């Protein structure tokens, strides 16, 4: 209601002629409204005798119709802006720790990271997001560069070398780190992605432009009919009054279709937001209803994200039970999801409830980044866990030996798309812990479903070729393309757009923003930030590509509703034609008066009722449009048969009886 | 009456079908770039001598070749008509035509209209007629057939860039399609009583004293080519009612079959080269349904005829006012619909003389765009535009993507479709409105009331659609009408054939794809009905006010 009044005010603002020529049929009814108002004015106050009241009546009706159509457009735009604000409205407050005496310093000034310029020095510590791009100059940590690659493995930034360029937005995990802001706030990575998305603009769906062609064609036809209808009738005798001529023009041109367009749009918007998937317009809904190829991100889209422990792989005769017990008791104190995941896996795959307790006298040995391995010392034991090379160094330094089959298992776990954590107890490697990703949850079966729908499936990732191949095969996609920088995303999506196939997209990071924006239908998840939500028309907080199957089904149904009502408009228009023609032709040959079928009261009443029915079509078609008709699966031939039968018969019959009952109203009321 | 008529239309269609079938096979052979049975060394020597060594053409080159041939023919025929007091074969020393009349005649013949605003018995001179008009009647028909050949190739060639050799198509289409069949029909007319001699106008004294001066030139030749090519431009003023041109009832029947021979066969051939004859049947059924409805309407209307004669005294009451006695009111009505829907233009009875409905149906068949078995070449691609539009709207209303015969219909092709389909009624309405709005064009009328308006409307409808028939009461020899109709015919023809080549070029690059859920069978009675609906509704919506104000107002009066 409040939104509706807000939309009404906006529509009357949108009256402005500069914006009227966006749609052709609308500007036509606009200029028609203008002509009839000018005629009404001069006639009522000037040198043109005639019935001023008829002209004022008709002119008001035309103006009214423009108002209603613009109001439907304003309602659509208002609902879209409302949902956009409700979904993209959240509190934000980036903060940075500006330093003085930048060796280490201790003057942490909580300056908003946006206010940082090049050359300024910053401090970041465990958990604090990297305020802006730059370089490292002291301290070494493990940044969570998941928004750049898509991976979740922490990468070591270590103040001098080739690992020295942090990125704004990525999170820091291990320990403190001082940064040297080496980019301006206007030329940051986020601004590069913003420039890309801003530079890209979406185009109209083929199904939209096709309808537009048909509308403009009908417009030309009726315009030529009436414009030339003036002198024909002139020759015979009295010329048809220009007022009835322009009135008939606007009554005959397919005005109804624009309002119906917006109506179907808001209909699909309501259904879509009702399916736990918010959108930006019914345009995106139909584009979802005609998806040809999906562009997926392995990390954060298909998988839930933040991969945790998975399966154990011991060495030769090392008593796998011992490996699981060691891993459980070692990763106990940890709090990161990977340690708790190791604990849960071991505890639910074996019986070791007795040993877990935090009251025992053990000095927890946390991660250090010098030796690069965590662990514990419970009783006469030194359990440690970490990278393969870190434990290799530890063993070789402790006068032990590093078996080779442990390294074989490590290479295997790397080939399976997982980071292997070797475990040691003294000087004997116990095995490996494979931190595989989370699960697809039935995506292979649903990709088979997609294949049944003849919709291509594509992957996008920035991982190694072998890892990409393994995870892609496990996903069931047709093919893959790895090391795909955002520019590569756009390159691929545009080279495929060259073929004309509607592309679907989804992804979470800042790196996937440009691809999301360009795609005609792209969904988003909660893992992504404003960079995600702001790029792409669609959104899905659930992060389950399954829903794409459902949303193309829903899009199918929306297209069906559009088609049916597209039959109604056509039928209604042509019925108006055959129902109004003779009633208008009543000035030169009375025989044509005898040709009337509905027997309207008079030509004035006829045209009046006609334009009235025009505006009525708009308003009374809004509800049935936003309601939506239930669809059942059927074949194109029978689909056409049924569509024609129901909507065609309804439309072709409506304007006749409608104008007849409005004529009954006219006669009994006595307006004229 | 109803028994003599049902039989007349029945045997007509049956015979036409049979002839169109083996013809269809032959045209299919010609559209697989395959040489006809015995003409493959003759063809080699002839093409080498003419310097037409085979090398394909994209759509731009094909289009430019056709237009260049047509402009060369136009220049030649224009200058020939202007200077016919220097050329031989002129027994009656007739003078050279005017500039306006020569311009209108040149433009009309070059664009397959054959609109006549003169009198051939006292204007042309056995040489403009022989080497000026018949040559055109061949080249014009060949140009139309060339374009539809290129279109059919566009549909069958998958993911290519060639559209055939224009010149080889013209040379094959003229030398082995038109000339022999035409020569055969020419000797046939000669046998029935038609005329073929280069004698001077004979002197004749009647059984009483009145002095007749019979005109006698080469008629059979022109008759055969003007009917087989659907040109419609006749040697005498009454183009086909004259006895020397249409002497016996048999000759009339051969004329109607010849009026349809090529277009019906092109429908069959299109149905064959694509390998699926169901497509051809779908097309033929669509056109034939409209045809039967129209013939029934016109026959019924005229058999009722003028009710005033009965009160004045006539024994029977059939509108036999502008119809020859060799044939009845039935054949006259049938031929009216046949020449009007087939875009030929030849009339065997004065169309102005029909009753109101008899004037409404033919005019209305012309206005829709000459798609019911239309002109040789022009009609089939007219009904390709309408078929493409029909799948465009069917797919649009059902909610799928439009694909036809495997190809994928893009927004670009649709744009061109709309463009062409509108270029014809725009000329019709604009020209008729301009004429009615000017005292000059208004003064040419010969009938008061709304029928007078029907005259102007019909004239421009024939011009824009290249039909070539006319209500004939309109005195359209003044310069105003010559230039107006010249402009209409020229723009109608070429405005409607350029977008066809554009669409052909686009579809030649498209590749055919496998069935889907957006592929609705275009063969069967659901597409047949969909298409009839498309054509009829488009036409009705575009012309109901004119029709209401013209023949209908005359009728109800």
């Amino acid at each position: 209601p409040t939104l509706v009044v807000q939309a009404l005010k906006e529509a009357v603002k949108k009256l402005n002629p500069q914006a009227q020529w966006r749609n052709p049929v609308m500007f036509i009814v606009w200029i028609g409204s203008l002509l009839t108002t000018c005629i009404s004015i001069a006639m009522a106050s000037g040198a043109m005798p005639g019935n001023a009241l008829f002209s004022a009546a008709i002119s008001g009706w035309l103006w009214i119709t423009v108002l209603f159509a613009n109001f439907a457009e304003a309602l659509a735009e208002g609902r879209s802006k409302a949902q956009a604000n409700s979904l993209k409205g959240v509190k934000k407050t980036a903060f940075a720790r500006k330093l003085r005496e930048p060796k280490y310093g201790a003057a942490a000034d909580k300056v908003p990271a946006d206010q940082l310029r090049k050359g300024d020095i910053v401090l970041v510590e465990a958990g604090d997001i990297i305020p802006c791009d730059g370089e490292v100059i002291e301290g070494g940590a493990s940044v969570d560069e998941s928004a750049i690659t898509g991976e979740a493995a922490p990468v070591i930034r270590e103040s001098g070398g080739d690992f020295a360029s942090v990125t704004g937005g990525t999170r820091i995990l291990s320990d403190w780190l001082v940064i040297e802001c080496s980019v301006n706030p206007g030329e940051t990575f986020l601004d590069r992605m913003i420039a890309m998305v801003e530079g890209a603009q979406r185009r109209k769906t083929p199904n939209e432009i096709a309808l537009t062609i048909l509308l403009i064609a009908l417009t030309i036809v009726f315009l030529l009919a009436t414009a030339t209808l003036w002198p024909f009738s002139a020759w015979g005798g009295n010329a048809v009054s220009v007022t009835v001529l322009v009135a008939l023009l606007v009554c005959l041109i397919p005005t109804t279709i624009g309002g119906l367009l917006s109506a179907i749009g808001v209909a699909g918007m309501s259904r879509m937001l009702g399916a736990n998937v918010i959108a930006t317009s019914g345009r995106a809904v139909e584009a979802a209803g005609d998806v040809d190829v999906l562009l997926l991100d392995k990390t954060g889209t298909i998988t839930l994200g933040n991969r945790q422990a998975s399966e154990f792989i011991p060495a030769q005769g090392v008593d796998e039970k011992t490996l699981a017990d060691a891993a459980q008791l070692a990763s106990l104190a940890d709090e990161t999801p990977e340690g708790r995941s190791i604990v849960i896996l071991a505890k639910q795959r074996f019986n070791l409830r007795e040993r877990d307790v935090q009251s025992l006298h053990a000095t927890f040995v946390p991660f250090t980044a010098q030796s690069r391995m965590s662990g514990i010392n419970i009783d006469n034991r030194m359990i440690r866990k970490g990278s393969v090379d870190a434990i290799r160094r530890h063993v070789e330094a402790n006068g032990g030996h590093f078996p080779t089959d442990v390294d074989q298992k490590v290479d295997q776990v790397a080939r399976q798309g997982a980071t292997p954590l070797v475990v040691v107890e003294g000087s004997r490697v116990l095995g490996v812990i494979a931190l595989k990703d989370i699960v697809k949850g039935g995506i292979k079966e649903r990709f088979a479903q997609l294949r049944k729908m003849g919709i291509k499936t594509v992957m996008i990732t920035g991982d190694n070729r072998l890892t990409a191949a393994a995870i892609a095969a496990e996903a069931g996609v047709d093919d893959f393309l790895a090391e795909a920088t955002p520019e590569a995303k756009l390159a691929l999506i545009r080279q495929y757009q060259a073929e004309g196939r509607l592309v679907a997209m989804t992804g979470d990071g800042t790196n996937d923003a440009p691809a999301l924006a360009q795609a005609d239908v792209a969904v988003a998840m909660n893992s992504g930030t404003q960079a995600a939500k702001e790029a792409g028309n669609m959104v899905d907080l659930d992060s389950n590509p399954t829903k794409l199957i459902e949303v193309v089904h829903i899009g199918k149904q929306m297209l069906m509703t559009r088609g049916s009502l597209t039959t109604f408009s056509i039928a209604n228009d042509v019925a108006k034609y055959f129902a109004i023609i003779p009633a208008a032709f009543a000035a030169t040959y009375p025989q044509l008066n005898a040709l009337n079928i509905m027997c309207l009261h008079s030509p004035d009443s006829a045209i009046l009722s006609a334009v009235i029915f025009n505006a009525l079509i708009i308003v009374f078609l809004i509800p049935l449009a936003l309601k939506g008709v239930s669809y059942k699966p059927l074949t194109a031939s029978a689909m056409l048969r049924r569509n024609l039968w129901i909507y065609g018969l309804g439309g072709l019959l409506v304007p006749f009886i409608g104008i007849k009952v409005i004529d009954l109203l006219l006669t009994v009321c006595g307006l004229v | 009456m109803a028994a003599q008529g049902f039989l007349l239309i029945a045997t007509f269609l049956l015979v036409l079908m049979v002839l169109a079938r083996p013809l269809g096979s032959g045209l299919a052979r010609l559209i697989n770039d395959i040489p006809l049975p015995g003409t493959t060394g003759v063809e080699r020597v002839l093409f080498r001598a003419l310097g037409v060594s085979d090398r394909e053409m994209n759509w731009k080159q094909y289009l430019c070749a056709i237009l260049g041939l047509n402009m060369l023919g136009l220049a030649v025929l224009f200058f020939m008509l202007l200077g016919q007091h220097y050329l031989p074969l002129n027994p009656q020393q007739l003078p050279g035509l005017s500039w306006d009349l020569a311009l209108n005649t040149a433009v009309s013949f070059v664009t397959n209209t054959n609109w006549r605003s003169y009198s051939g018995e006292t204007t042309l001179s056995y040489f403009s007629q022989m080497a000026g008009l018949t040559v055109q009647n061949f080249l014009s028909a060949a140009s139309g057939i060339a374009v539809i050949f290129a279109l059919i190739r566009a549909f069958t060639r998958q993911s290519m860039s060639t559209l055939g050799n224009a010149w080889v198509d013209l040379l094959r289409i003229t030398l082995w399609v038109l000339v022999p069949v035409a020569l055969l029909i020419a000797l046939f007319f000669i046998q029935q009583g038609a005329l073929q001699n280069f004698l001077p106008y004979q002197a004749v004294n009647t059984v009483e004293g009145a002095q007749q001066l019979l005109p006698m030139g080469p008629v059979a030749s022109q008759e055969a080519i003007k009917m087989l090519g659907t040109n419609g431009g006749g040697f005498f003023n009454a183009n086909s009612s004259h006895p020397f041109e249409n002497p016996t009832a048999l000759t009339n029947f051969v004329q109607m079959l010849a009026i349809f021979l090529i277009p019906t066969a092109l429908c069959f051939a299109f149905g064959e080269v694509m390998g699926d004859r169901r497509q051809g049947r779908m097309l033929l059924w669509a056109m034939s349904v409209i045809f039967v409805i129209c013939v029934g309407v016109v026959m019924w209307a005229e058999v009722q005829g003028n009710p005033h004669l009965l009160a004045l005294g006539t024994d029977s009451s059939i509108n036999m006012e502008g119809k020859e006695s060799r044939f009845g009111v039935l054949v006259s009505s049938l031929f009216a619909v046949v020449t009007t829907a087939a875009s030929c233009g030849a009339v065997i009875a004065m169309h102005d003389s029909f009753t109101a409905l008899g004037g409404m149906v033919p005019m209305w068949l012309m206005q829709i765009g000459e798609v019911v078995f239309g002109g040789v070449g022009s009609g089939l691609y007219g009904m390709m535009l309408f078929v493409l539009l029909a799948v465009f709207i069917a797919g649009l209303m059902i909610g799928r993507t439009p694909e036809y015969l495997g190809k994928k219909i893009d927004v670009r092709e649709m744009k061109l479709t709309a463009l062409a389909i509108l270029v014809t009624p725009t000329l019709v309405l604009m020209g008729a409105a301009l004429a009615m709005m000017t005292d000059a064009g208004r003064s040419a009328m010969l009938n008061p009331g709304p029928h007078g308006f029907s005259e102007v409307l019909y004239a421009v409808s024939s011009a824009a659609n290249n039909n070539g028939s006319a209500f004939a009461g309109l005195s359209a020899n003044s310069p105003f009408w010559n230039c107006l109709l010249a402009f209409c015919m020229f723009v109608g023809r070429f405005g409607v054939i350029i977008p066809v080549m554009a669409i052909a070029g686009s579809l030649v690059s498209k590749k055919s794809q496998a069935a889907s859920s957006g592929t609705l069978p275009t063969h069967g009675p659901l597409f047949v009905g969909l298409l009839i609906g498309t054509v009829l509704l488009v036409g009705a919506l575009t012309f109901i006010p004119a029709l209401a104000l013209g023949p209908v107002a005359e009728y109800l009066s």
Partner: peptide, 26 residues
């Protein structure tokens, strides 16, 4: 008359506008 010529002028330029809009995908 003045009104007639002005009307036809308006209709002509309007047809130019509509055909332009048709050939476009604005």
């Amino acid at each position: 008359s003045a009104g007639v010529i002005t009307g036809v002028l308006l209709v002509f330029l309007l047809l130019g506008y509509l055909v332009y809009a048709l050939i476009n995908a604005e």
